[PDB]
Every structure is written in structure tokens, then in C-alpha cells.
Design a binder for these strands. Structure first.
Ligand SMILES: [Mn+2]
Length: 176
DNA sequence: CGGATATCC
DNA sequence: CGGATATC
């Protein structure tokens, strides 16, 4: 897919927020805009985007196996490059051009960890995780872990997570 | 099967 | 000077 401007990316996502669904048990089930979070370079407000990244909050674990694998987009021509329960890479047609649209899923309990992870940028994640690794912790898009045990942080938002991990908060467009 | 090899932030 | 996913 080609690079997009920030405005083009936003236009695509606004189109998608009313047109995403999944096919399951003979039903075409709407993915609510409520549960669609822009992530990646779009959330970082980069002036040129590599692709469009969306995080879908799946509020029911047993549905993970059925959401991305049966993803449907009304009013859009697209093909699927790879597609599993957690990552689905699509190539969409938009105004005579092809763009990459990446879809990822998070469960409710994972949400702040997922937003933090998928926001990036990669260089920033590597430095943060390196520091935590030195203290025998592991951070990923699902949680914070010590000795392969989930560390039960009392947090709701990404901002709260960052503070709880002991790092300086920066808005998405200022992380590097 | 999955270890090997494309991929994501 | 990280960590996880998809395909076969
Ligand atoms: Mn992407």
C-alpha cells in the first residue's frame, strides 16, 4: 500500500467506523465505533502514514476466534494478506489507490496495554521494555508480568499505565 | 505438526 | 540494547 496523508487516513477511518462487522452463526454483527480505537502512526498524528492501524476491542473472549477471521467491510473493495484472531492485514481500495489497513484485537482487561503497545513508536517501546527487562519484568500488549505471573495493576487508561510503570507521560504525537 | 520465515507496534 | 502474530 502507498503512503497516506493524516487527513486521508482520518477520512478512511471515519468511513470504516460505520461499516465494520463480522459474519458469525448466520448473523452479520456490527463492530461498534465505540470499540474501534485508532492506533499506530494515525494515533501519533504523523503527517504521512505508512498504513492505517485500528484496534478493535472485543468485549467477549470466546468471540476472538470469530471476529477478524470473518471481518466484513460494507462499501469497500479489499483483499486479505494475513488474518488471524489478533492481527489481520488488509489491502483496501480507496479513491483509485491501494492502502494497507491493519486490524488488531484486544480484550477489555488488555485495553490500556494494547493502546500503549499499538501506539508505539517502535523505538520508544524498545527502550521502555529494555528498562523493565533489566528489572526482571516483561511488558507486552496484554499486561505486565513478573516470573510469568500477571502483575495486577489497578489502572484503566494508558496514561495511568505509563505512570504506574514509572515513566514520564507524553501524548502520542510526542513519543519517540 | 510446527520451526522457519514473513510480519505487526 | 523488546515482544508477539500468521502461515504452513
Ligand atoms: Mn500498520
Amino acid at each position: 500500500g502507498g503512503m497516506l496523508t493524516l487527513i486521508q487516513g482520518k477520512k478512511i477511518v471515519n468511513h470504516l467506523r460505520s461499516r465494520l462487522a463480522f459474519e458469525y452463526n448466520g448473523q452479520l454483527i456490527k463492530i461498534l465505533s465505540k470499540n474501534i480505537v485508532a492506533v499506530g502512526s494515525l494515533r501519533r498524528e504523523e503527517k504521512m502514514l505508512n498504513d492505517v492501524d485500528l484496534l478493535i476491542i472485543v468485549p467477549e473472549k470466546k468471540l476472538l476466534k470469530h471476529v477478524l477471521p470473518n471481518i466484513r467491510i460494507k462499501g469497500l473493495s479489499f483483499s486479505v494478506k494475513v488474518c488471524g484472531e489478533r492481527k489481520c492485514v488488509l489491502f483496501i481500495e480507496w479513491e483509485k489507490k491501494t492502502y494497507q489497513l491493519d486490524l488488531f484485537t484486544a480484550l477489555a482487561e488488555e485495553k490500556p496495554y494494547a493502546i500503549f503497545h499499538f501506539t508505539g513508536p517502535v523505538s520508544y517501546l524498545i527502550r521502555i521494555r529494555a528498562a523493565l527487562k533489566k528489572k526482571n519484568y516483561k511488558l507486552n500488549q496484554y499486561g505486565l508480568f513478573k516470573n510469568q505471573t500477571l502483575v495486577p495493576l489497578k489502572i484503566t487508561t494508558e496514561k495511568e499505565l505509563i505512570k504506574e510503570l514509572g515513566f514520564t507521560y507524553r501524548i502520542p504525537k510526542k513519543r519517540l
